[PDB]
Amino acid sequence: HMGLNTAIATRVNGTPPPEVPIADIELGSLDFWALDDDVRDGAFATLRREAPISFWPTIELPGFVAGNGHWALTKYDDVFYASRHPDIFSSYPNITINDQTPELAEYFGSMIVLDDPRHQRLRSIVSRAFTPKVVARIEAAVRDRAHRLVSSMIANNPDRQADLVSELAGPLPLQIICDMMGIPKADHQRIFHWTNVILGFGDPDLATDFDEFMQVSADIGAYATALAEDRRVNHHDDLTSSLVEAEVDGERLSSREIASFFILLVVAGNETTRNAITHGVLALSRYPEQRDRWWSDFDGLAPTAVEEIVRWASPVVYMRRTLTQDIELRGTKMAAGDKVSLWYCSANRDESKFADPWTFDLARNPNPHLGFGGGGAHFCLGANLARREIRVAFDELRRQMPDVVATEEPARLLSQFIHGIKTLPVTWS
Template structure:
């Protein structure tokens, strides 16, 4: 498929404001916007991409004070450029929340994703020991073994909810085994990681803000306590798991504190479990919706697997955005921003930018090149587990292709009510 040459950091001169599409009906801070059908949201982002970065006011969030507002970065060029400038576009005080988080949240959600160098570099240097080529190679057989067991169970079960029986199971068991979490705790990890990434969904968080905050903090506390108990045991009885490697890690005299271990575990379960689960769920939905692409992939699975997985991640964009805060005045591709401004990097919009992707709304498993930002933009915060996620998605679809090639969604997905995660709560399937 022919593609325009990707470009980041440069944009054409702004058009006559009178000729720009109307965006007065778009409010990215309104929960109602995120309840719109996906096609309407993608159309809204396409209109926003024709404008310079737009400013949006923050909505009140219960006891959390209303913030000063934020600029929405929606083009591939702007998101990539901001990602390459971490000293200007800082992850502190928070990358995962547009409002500044209350103090109590930092204990559980203050992981390295919310930090800047040198603290970010220190933590990443330590935890990256669990993601070396050698460690990931050891996981290869485990991922395949777990995927086969999941599909064995699927064949026995028959028509079911694909999310609960297939998509959620593989990344959950892989991460828990990496960390050494006993199987008896797997359901608890899944439940709490789903709560952490529930967005505004009342099925997970309840109907009011106070209940939501309580449930979020409890989920963080439960995950952190689980890891603290395991870490204490591994210090005395180390094994070959990632928890042992982390509690015994010493890089240039540095090691992880219990709080850092807990928040990293929350990051790993959330980022490595929920996002991969959603990519697999979206994958089945897309292959059902676009049967020509399924036939093409199934005609030579290995030939198309690499590009198909990248296209699923681009098209679905499981993580919709990350926040940054400017440390100094900066001109972003001709647009002036000021120190202290919040900027929200909308990966889901950048991945549909026609300046980079030909026919961006077309799902095409042969797309090449495919410089999507589904694992984050270039720079120090690129997803540490991207390679593992790619392997899990590939292996899961390989087993489905091999054992149940006719598997398909039988209804539209039930979507998560969230502006942060493009999540699927359930997806009925049959084969």
């Protein structure tokens, strides 16, 4: 093949993975989430065909309460419908499939696990900072950090080998959200370690002891509380100050509400875009013709290329809802109180919605992917920020090291919730 000698194998674009026998699919087993993407993708293809709504037991993880199982929605239309009907598909009490507990709610009782009106009143505290016009004004900050990170990949590695995750994909979004929050630079890596554990728990490379998970949670919560108290006394133009100054229903946020909001923002900002970027580099490595067509017309294709990277990566695998009333979908009766899981990873391969879903096409248009969710009340707050982080990251790679390519298959995060890559070795000429 053309390119650098140690580059990973390319793939034939458009090739569907073989569908997987349904007896080999166990969404309730961590072993299933360790299988490679080709098997996972073929398994969701089987479900879309043979069991588009199906029930599964909740995965067991140390210290978490699995509780009741869940109805898995694997078809695009059902995920879209559920997302747009929050009066039936509630975000309370939790948006992962395990049960919420009072101990967890101290740190994880943010607006993401609330319905309107309280959800929207909370979201309005920070929403202006995430609008397209306001995010556009921090292009210079995104450029400066991305440009320096790529330059540092070159300066730090005389052998021209680097880990894309630790050296670019992780640190770029980390800096941007942490600066928006008003966190001093010296603490950004501490924040990143905490969010890595929070949304890596169950992978032995991150953490498997529930006491470590709760220590991390308490530590980031205490960090948030201390920063908030500083900003209460002396305002800065940052989101932490916005949080401590706001009122909802005439009342300031409590310390639990502040901590939960801070944690939500840094976790979501740190554990999503990095995976879009890393899966995007993996895809360019497997499909060099797509790299070439983007590099030849970077600004023209960037809108569609960023969206296709998000559809392909589906960084957030699923979100959970809870029914407030009985409902029948696709011939399956589901009861008030039942858990419902929305498989964005599967919606984003649904042949009923996408022409040629197995083709990675950076010009894809239209591209109604559900990578940021199905739309409606909880539509990703960070979507404009994420799209800009992704575009800039690839533009800086294109400009400085255009032939950057993966040299090993990724080390995959063991997670049902996040489509994570822990490490991706790359090289460039």
